[PDB]
Amino acid sequence: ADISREPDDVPPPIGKRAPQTVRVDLLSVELEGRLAEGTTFGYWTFNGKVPGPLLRVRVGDTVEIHLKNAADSAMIHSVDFHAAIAPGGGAAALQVEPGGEKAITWKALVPGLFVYHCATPMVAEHIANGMYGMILVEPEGGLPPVDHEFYVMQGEIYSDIPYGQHGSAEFSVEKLLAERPEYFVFNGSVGALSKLHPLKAKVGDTVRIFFGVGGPNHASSFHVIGEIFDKVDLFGGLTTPPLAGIQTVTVPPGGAAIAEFKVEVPGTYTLVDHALARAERGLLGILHVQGPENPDIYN
Amino acid sequence: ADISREPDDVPPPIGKRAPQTVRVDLLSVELEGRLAEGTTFGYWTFNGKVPGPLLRVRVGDTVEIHLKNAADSAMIHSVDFHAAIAPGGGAAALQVEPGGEKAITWKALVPGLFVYHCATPMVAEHIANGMYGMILVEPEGGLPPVDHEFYVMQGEIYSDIPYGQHGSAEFSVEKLLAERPEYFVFNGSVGALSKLHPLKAKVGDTVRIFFGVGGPNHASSFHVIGEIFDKVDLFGGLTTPPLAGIQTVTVPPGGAAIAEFKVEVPGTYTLVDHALARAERGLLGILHVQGPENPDIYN
Amino acid sequence: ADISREPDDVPPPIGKRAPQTVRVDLLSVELEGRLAEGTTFGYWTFNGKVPGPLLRVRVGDTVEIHLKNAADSAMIHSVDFHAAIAPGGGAAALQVEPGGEKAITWKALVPGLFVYHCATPMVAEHIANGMYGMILVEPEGGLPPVDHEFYVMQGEIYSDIPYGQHGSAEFSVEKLLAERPEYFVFNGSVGALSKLHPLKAKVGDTVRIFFGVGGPNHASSFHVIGEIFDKVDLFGGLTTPPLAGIQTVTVPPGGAAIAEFKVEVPGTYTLVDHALARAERGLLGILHVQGPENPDIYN
Ligand SMILES: [Cl-]
Ligand SMILES: [Cl-]
Ligand SMILES: [Cl-]
Ligand SMILES: [Cu+2]
Ligand SMILES: [Cu+2]
Ligand SMILES: [Cu+2]
Ligand SMILES: [Cu+2]
Ligand SMILES: [Cu+2]
Ligand SMILES: [Cu+2]
Ligand SMILES: [Er+3]
Ligand SMILES: [Er+3]
Ligand SMILES: [Er+3]
Ligand SMILES: [Er+3]
Ligand SMILES: [Er+3]
Ligand SMILES: [Er+3]
Ligand SMILES: [Er+3]
Ligand SMILES: [Er+3]
Ligand SMILES: [Er+3]
Ligand SMILES: [Er+3]
Ligand SMILES: [Er+3]
Ligand SMILES: [Er+3]
Ligand SMILES: [Tb+3]
Ligand SMILES: [Tb+3]
Ligand SMILES: [Tb+3]
Ligand SMILES: [Y+3]
Ligand SMILES: [Y+3]
Ligand SMILES: [Y+3]
Ligand SMILES: [Y+3]
Ligand SMILES: [Y+3]
Ligand SMILES: [Y+3]
Ligand SMILES: [Yb+3]
Ligand SMILES: [Yb+3]
Ligand SMILES: [Yb+3]
Ligand SMILES: [Yb+3]
Ligand SMILES: [Yb+3]
Ligand SMILES: [Yb+3]
Ligand SMILES: [Yb+3]
Ligand SMILES: [Yb+3]
Ligand SMILES: [Yb+3]
C-alpha cells in the first residue's frame, strides 16, 4: 500500500574501517501503491519502495550486488550504478528475468553520492515507474558526523489519467516522450514527506540531506525554505571541496547533491524544487523543527 | 504605467562598516502595467515595480523588515528571504492582509546574493505576477569596487491571451501548471532593458551584474553576447572563491549569480538566456558601450 | 548526404608554442542531409557538417576569421564566438550575404572551451538548423595529453513532420517557440555516434570529450553510462581548477564541458543526456572499448 520510502531510512555511517567486500541484495517488485489520496499507480520498485534502498560503502570496497526478480513480475529488470566502472554500469550482465537471479562484483574507486536505476529498455519508463536509488561511497576516513541524515529523491509520474482524478493509474508513453508528467513526487508519492513521513529535527542540529533526482527527464532546483545550505557537494562528488553558503542548487536527472545545514530556529521548513508549480503537483516536503525560540536569529 | 525596474537602480555599496540594524520598508501593490507595446497585465509588485527593490546589507546585520499591504489590494501578500534562517524565510509571520502591516527581525549569517519573493498560496502565481527581488549580503570587508553595478532578474508571464495579442492580460493557472509562459521578461516587461532602460557602460569599465531568476518555473543560462565573465559567483554565494572565465552560467529558479566582466571593445552587447527562443518572447537586454575602438582585441 | 561530424575529427593539440596569428576559413552551406533512416532535413551548416569544425587556438592568439557564404545559399549567415570580446561575438560585422565574404580579427584572452554559432535573425532557427560549433582556447602550456580526444555537440531538430515519419523535413517555427523538438541529436543526426561514427577506445586509455550544447533551447545532463568523469571543466572554463569525480554534469545551451575519464573495463559505453526520454528521440552515443577483462574493477 505504502510505496513511499522514509527519509530517515539511512544505513549507519562507515567509520574509519578498511576496504572490504560488501554484499547487496536487491529485489525488483511490481506492486500497486498509493500515489495520492484515492489514486493508485503501477509501481516498479527496488525492495517494494520508491526510491530504492540507500546503499553505503567505502572507497576501495568491492560491492557484490545480487539482483533477484520477483516471480510475479511482468518486466525484465536491471540496475545501473553510477559508482561503477562497468558496461551499462553493471546492468549489461544484470538483465534478470522474473524468477531468476544474477550477480556481479564491482569496485568503488570514486567517492561521492551516486544514482542507481534500472537500465532495461525502455530505460525512461523503468525509472519513471520508480526504479531509482542512491549509493553513497564514503571517502577514506568518512564524512564528518551530523545530528540527522536524510534520504530524498525526486521523481516524475506519467499517469494516463489527469492530476486530481482518483482510480487506477498506468504509465503513459505519450506523456513520457512529451516530457509532461502529471505528478512530481518526493520519495514515491504525493505527500510522502508531508502527510506520510515528515522530516523531524531539533534546534541546533546539523542536517545532511542525501538528495538525488531519479527524473527521468527534469532537473531539480533543490531548496529548503527557511534554510541556507552550509555545504553542498555539487553533483554529489566527494573529491573536490564543497561549495559554501548556497540558497538553491541545480541537481540534474541522474545527478546528486549532499546538502548540509545547521538549524537555528524552530518551526516548519519546506523541501521543494524551486520550480514551484511542481509543488502543486505533489513535490512538497515538510521538516518539523521543535525546540526553544532564538530571537537573535529570527524574531 | 511603467512597472519595469531600472538596472541602474542599485543601493550604494557597504564599505568596511560594522554590523548594524537595518530597517526595510516593502509595500505590496497591485497595479496595471505595460507588459508589451499595446499589452497590459495585472502585476503584483513590491514597491510598484518588477522586480522588487534590490536590498543591500552586511553579514551580521539584523534586518528589520516591515511589510505593508496596499488598501486596494485584492490578495494576501508575504515575503520569503533566502538570506533568512526562519520558517518560510520569515513569511510565516509576514502574511499581511490588504491594509495591515506586520514586522519581523532576522539576522544575516551567510554572505551572497539571495532571492526574495512572496510566499502566499499559491506561491507560483504570486511570483509569476512579479513579486520577486534580491537581497545582497556583503561579506566582512565588502566586494571589490567596480565601475558599474546592475540589477537584472528573469521572470515568466502566464497571460491568458497569446503572445502578440494586444489588450488586458490576466494570469492563467492552466499555463502555469503546464509551465508554458507566453512571455519571458527581464525586469518586468518586454524591452525593459532594450527599448526602455538600456544598460550603458564605457570602454575599460568593470561591470557587475547582480543576476537572479524569479522564475517561477524555468532556469536561465545567463550569457552576455560579446563578453566573457571574468568572475562568477555560482548560485550567488560569496563564501567559496568564484569561477573564472565562464561563457554561460546556469542560474536556477530562486537562484542567483554575480557576473563580473571587463568591457574592452565599444558597441552593442546583448543580455540573453541562451535558450534563445525566449529572446523572441521578450527575453532580450541591451548593453550600449561607448568609447574608442580597440583593434588589438577586436578589429 | 552525411551531415554528421565525426567525434574523432579533432585538430592536433597546441604544444608549448608562443602566441601567433591563426587564420580560420568557415563556409556556410545549406544542403539536404540524412537526419534519420528514410528521413532528410534542410540543414544549415558550417563546412557542410553538424556541428561545425572544432577550432583550436592558444591564449593570446589573434584569430583571423574569414566567413564565406555559398552562392546557392538562401539565407544570410554569421558566426558568434563565445571566446571573443566583440559586439555580437564578432557577428556584428560578419553578416555575410550568399556569395560574399567578410573578415575580422579578434584576440583570445580567456582559456576554455567556447561555443560558436550563427547569430543572424532569427538566431534560434539558424542554430537549430545546425549552425553551431566549438572553439578551444588552450592555456599557457596547454592541456595534459590524453590517449583519445573527441568532439561531441548536442542539438535539437524542429521538424514539421513527427518523429518516425520518413520524407523531407523542414524547420517548424511553431515547435521552436513551443520548445518542443521532434529529434534530439548528437553531432547532427540520429545514430551519428551510434550506427554512423561510434567512438572507439582501448582499455587503459584516458579519454577527453570536448562536449558542448548547440541547443538552442534545452540544457544537457551529460553522462557516459558505465563511467565516472575524473575531471570536469564546468561550463568549459580552463581557468578555475576542475571538479573531480562527477557522475552527471549540467551543460547549459551555449555552454560547454571538458569531461576526462580513464577507461578500465572493456565493453560498450553509452553517451546520453540523462533526460533519457531524449534517448528515444535519437540522443544516443556509443563508445566501444576493446581489450582484456579487468576482474578487479568489474567481474
Ligand atoms: Cl529495504
Ligand atoms: Cl523602490
Ligand atoms: Cl571541415
Ligand atoms: Cu526495471
Ligand atoms: Cu544513469
Ligand atoms: Cu503576493
Ligand atoms: Cu524561495
Ligand atoms: Cu545562419
Ligand atoms: Cu551565443
Ligand atoms: Er554486507
Ligand atoms: Er504501469
Ligand atoms: Er548535543
Ligand atoms: Er538577549
Ligand atoms: Er536603514
Ligand atoms: Er492577474
Ligand atoms: Er578611470
Ligand atoms: Er598598434
Ligand atoms: Er593557420
Ligand atoms: Er529548413
Ligand atoms: Er601506452
Ligand atoms: Er588476481
Ligand atoms: Tb547535537
Ligand atoms: Tb574606471
Ligand atoms: Tb596509453
Ligand atoms: Y538501515
Ligand atoms: Y552532538
Ligand atoms: Y538606491
Ligand atoms: Y576607476
Ligand atoms: Y583536423
Ligand atoms: Y601513453
Ligand atoms: Yb549497504
Ligand atoms: Yb519477456
Ligand atoms: Yb511555522
Ligand atoms: Yb537596503
Ligand atoms: Yb481574503
Ligand atoms: Yb554594434
Ligand atoms: Yb583551428
Ligand atoms: Yb535577402
Ligand atoms: Yb557489452
Side-chain angles (χ1 to χ4, degrees):
Chain A
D2 186 25
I3 43 85
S4 303
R5 189 164 292 274
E6 297 172 331
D8 54 305
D9 191 17
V10 175
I14 282 91
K16 295 158 271 74
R17 69 153 178 82
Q20 68 191 24
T21 309
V22 181
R23 192 193 166 104
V24 175
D25 298 289
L26 287 176
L27 171 71
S28 58
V29 193
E30 306 177 20
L31 70 99
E32 197 77 9
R34 175 209 169 272
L35 163 69
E37 290 294 327
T39 321
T40 55
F41 183 80
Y43 281 94
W44 308 340
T45 63
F46 286 113
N47 291 19
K49 287 161 83 188
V50 180
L54 172 65
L55 309 167
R56 206 166 187 164
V57 295
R58 191 203 182 274
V59 182
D61 282 15
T62 308
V63 181
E64 185 198 19
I65 164 73
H66 292 250
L67 190 73
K68 175 82 182 184
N69 200 358
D72 57 309
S73 293
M75 297 296 289
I76 306 160
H77 297 304
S78 57
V79 57
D80 169 10
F81 299 97
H82 283 217
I85 312 294
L94 272 176
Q95 299 291 329
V96 181
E97 288 281 355
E101 185 189 320
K102 283 189 174 76
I104 55 143
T105 59
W106 61 271
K107 193 181 180 178
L109 287 157
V110 174
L113 183 62
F114 297 95
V115 172
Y116 76 74
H117 58 88
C118 185
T120 309
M122 67 159 75
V123 181
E125 176 181 26
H126 286 254
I127 297 168
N129 291 339
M131 298 191 79
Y132 48 82
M134 307 216 81
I135 164 81
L136 174 72
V137 186
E138 284 193 55
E140 180 161 44
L143 283 162
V146 288
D147 299 79
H148 290 271
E149 283 186 335
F150 294 108
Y151 173 57
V152 177
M153 284 200 82
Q154 181 170 310
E156 298 148 31
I157 299 292
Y158 293 89
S159 56
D160 58 337
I161 47 170
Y163 175 93
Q165 175 82 78
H166 300 152
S168 300
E170 68 195 46
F171 176 84
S172 184
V173 67
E174 293 80 4
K175 267 87 168 289
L176 187 271
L177 291 165
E179 291 178 32
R180 281 194 151 266
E182 291 286 343
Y183 296 85
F184 284 92
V185 289
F186 280 129
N187 292 21
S189 70
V190 170
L193 306 181
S194 297
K195 133 82 190 162
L196 262 61
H197 316 282
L199 281 80
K200 282 187 179 179
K202 293 184 180 184
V203 174
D205 288 341
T206 51
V207 174
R208 174 149 55 203
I209 296 170
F210 301 103
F211 180 81
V213 176
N217 287 333
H218 302 281
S220 183
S221 306
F222 188 60
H223 172 84
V224 176
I225 305 182
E227 277 294 332
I228 311 165
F229 304 124
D230 297 336
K231 284 163 190 174
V232 169
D233 296 300
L234 195 69
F235 304 118
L238 282 170
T239 321
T240 295
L243 282 157
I246 269 76
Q247 54 183 321
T248 310
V249 52
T250 298
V251 188
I258 300 163
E260 297 172 14
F261 54 93
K262 174 93 163 180
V263 186
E264 300 280 19
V265 167
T268 308
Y269 293 83
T270 313
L271 278 85
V272 284
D273 170 17
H274 218 285
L276 283 163
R278 303 174 187 183
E280 301 293 334
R281 289 191 174 270
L283 201 59
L284 192 89
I286 297 298
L287 169 67
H288 286 295
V289 176
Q290 294 172 29
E293 293 170 331
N294 196 349
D296 284 49
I297 308 302
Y298 164 71
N299 189 291
Chain B
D2 186 25
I3 43 85
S4 303
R5 189 164 292 274
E6 297 172 331
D8 54 305
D9 191 17
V10 175
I14 282 91
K16 295 158 271 74
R17 69 153 178 82
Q20 68 191 24
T21 309
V22 181
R23 192 193 166 104
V24 175
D25 298 289
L26 287 176
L27 171 71
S28 58
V29 193
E30 306 177 20
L31 70 99
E32 197 77 9
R34 175 209 169 272
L35 163 69
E37 290 294 327
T39 321
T40 55
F41 183 80
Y43 281 94
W44 308 340
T45 63
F46 286 113
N47 291 19
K49 287 161 83 188
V50 180
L54 172 65
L55 309 167
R56 206 166 187 164
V57 295
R58 191 203 182 274
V59 182
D61 282 15
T62 308
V63 181
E64 185 198 19
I65 164 73
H66 292 250
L67 190 73
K68 175 82 182 184
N69 200 358
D72 57 309
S73 293
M75 297 296 289
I76 306 160
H77 297 304
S78 57
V79 57
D80 169 10
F81 299 97
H82 283 217
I85 312 294
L94 272 176
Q95 299 291 329
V96 181
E97 288 281 355
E101 185 189 320
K102 283 189 174 76
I104 55 143
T105 59
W106 61 271
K107 193 181 180 178
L109 287 157
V110 174
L113 183 62
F114 297 95
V115 172
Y116 76 74
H117 58 88
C118 185
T120 309
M122 67 159 75
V123 181
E125 176 181 26
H126 286 254
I127 297 168
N129 291 339
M131 298 191 79
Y132 48 82
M134 307 216 81
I135 164 81
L136 174 72
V137 186
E138 284 193 55
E140 180 161 44
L143 283 162
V146 288
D147 299 79
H148 290 271
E149 283 186 335
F150 294 108
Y151 173 57
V152 177
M153 284 200 82
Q154 181 170 310
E156 298 148 31
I157 299 292
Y158 293 89
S159 56
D160 58 337
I161 47 170
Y163 175 93
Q165 175 82 78
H166 300 152
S168 300
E170 68 195 46
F171 176 84
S172 184
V173 67
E174 293 80 4
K175 267 87 168 289
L176 187 271
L177 291 165
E179 291 178 32
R180 281 194 151 266
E182 291 286 343
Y183 296 85
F184 284 92
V185 289
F186 280 129
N187 292 21
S189 70
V190 170
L193 306 181
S194 297
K195 133 82 190 162
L196 262 61
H197 316 282
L199 281 80
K200 282 187 179 179
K202 293 184 180 184
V203 174
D205 288 341
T206 51
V207 174
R208 174 149 55 203
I209 296 170
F210 301 103
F211 180 81
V213 176
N217 287 333
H218 302 281
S220 183
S221 306
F222 188 60
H223 172 84
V224 176
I225 305 182
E227 277 294 332
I228 311 165
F229 304 124
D230 297 336
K231 284 163 190 174
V232 169
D233 296 300
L234 195 69
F235 304 118
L238 282 170
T239 321
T240 295
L243 282 157
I246 269 76
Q247 54 183 321
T248 310
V249 52
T250 298
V251 188
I258 300 163
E260 297 172 14
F261 54 93
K262 174 93 163 180
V263 186
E264 300 280 19
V265 167
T268 308
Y269 293 83
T270 313
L271 278 85
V272 284
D273 170 17
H274 218 285
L276 283 163
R278 303 174 187 183
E280 301 293 334
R281 289 191 174 270
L283 201 59
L284 192 89
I286 297 298
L287 169 67
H288 286 295
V289 176
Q290 294 172 29
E293 293 170 331
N294 196 349
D296 284 49
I297 308 302
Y298 164 71
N299 189 291
Chain C
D2 186 25
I3 43 85
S4 303
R5 189 164 292 274
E6 297 172 331
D8 54 305
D9 191 17
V10 175
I14 282 91
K16 295 158 271 74
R17 69 153 178 82
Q20 68 191 24
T21 309
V22 181
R23 192 193 166 104
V24 175
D25 298 289
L26 287 176
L27 171 71
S28 58
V29 193
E30 306 177 20
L31 70 99
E32 197 77 9
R34 175 209 169 272
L35 163 69
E37 290 294 327
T39 321
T40 55
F41 183 80
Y43 281 94
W44 308 340
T45 63
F46 286 113
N47 291 19
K49 287 161 83 188
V50 180
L54 172 65
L55 309 167
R56 206 166 187 164
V57 295
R58 191 203 182 274
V59 182
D61 282 15
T62 308
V63 181
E64 185 198 19
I65 164 73
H66 292 250
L67 190 73
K68 175 82 182 184
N69 200 358
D72 57 309
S73 293
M75 297 296 289
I76 306 160
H77 297 304
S78 57
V79 57
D80 169 10
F81 299 97
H82 283 217
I85 312 294
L94 272 176
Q95 299 291 329
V96 181
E97 288 281 355
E101 185 189 320
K102 283 189 174 76
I104 55 143
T105 59
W106 61 271
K107 193 181 180 178
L109 287 157
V110 174
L113 183 62
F114 297 95
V115 172
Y116 76 74
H117 58 88
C118 185
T120 309
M122 67 159 75
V123 181
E125 176 181 26
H126 286 254
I127 297 168
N129 291 339
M131 298 191 79
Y132 48 82
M134 307 216 81
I135 164 81
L136 174 72
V137 186
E138 284 193 55
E140 180 161 44
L143 283 162
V146 288
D147 299 79
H148 290 271
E149 283 186 335
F150 294 108
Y151 173 57
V152 177
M153 284 200 82
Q154 181 170 310
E156 298 148 31
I157 299 292
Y158 293 89
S159 56
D160 58 337
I161 47 170
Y163 175 93
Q165 175 82 78
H166 300 152
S168 300
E170 68 195 46
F171 176 84
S172 184
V173 67
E174 293 80 4
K175 267 87 168 289
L176 187 271
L177 291 165
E179 291 178 32
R180 281 194 151 266
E182 291 286 343
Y183 296 85
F184 284 92
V185 289
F186 280 129
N187 292 21
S189 70
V190 170
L193 306 181
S194 297
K195 133 82 190 162
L196 262 61
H197 316 282
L199 281 80
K200 282 187 179 179
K202 293 184 180 184
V203 174
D205 288 341
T206 51
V207 174
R208 174 149 55 203
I209 296 170
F210 301 103
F211 180 81
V213 176
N217 287 333
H218 302 281
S220 183
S221 306
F222 188 60
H223 172 84
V224 176
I225 305 182
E227 277 294 332
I228 311 165
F229 304 124
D230 297 336
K231 284 163 190 174
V232 169
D233 296 300
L234 195 69
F235 304 118
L238 282 170
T239 321
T240 295
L243 282 157
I246 269 76
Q247 54 183 321
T248 310
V249 52
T250 298
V251 188
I258 300 163
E260 297 172 14
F261 54 93
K262 174 93 163 180
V263 186
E264 300 280 19
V265 167
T268 308
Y269 293 83
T270 313
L271 278 85
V272 284
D273 170 17
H274 218 285
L276 283 163
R278 303 174 187 183
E280 301 293 334
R281 289 191 174 270
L283 201 59
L284 192 89
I286 297 298
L287 169 67
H288 286 295
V289 176
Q290 294 172 29
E293 293 170 331
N294 196 349
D296 284 49
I297 308 302
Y298 164 71
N299 189 291

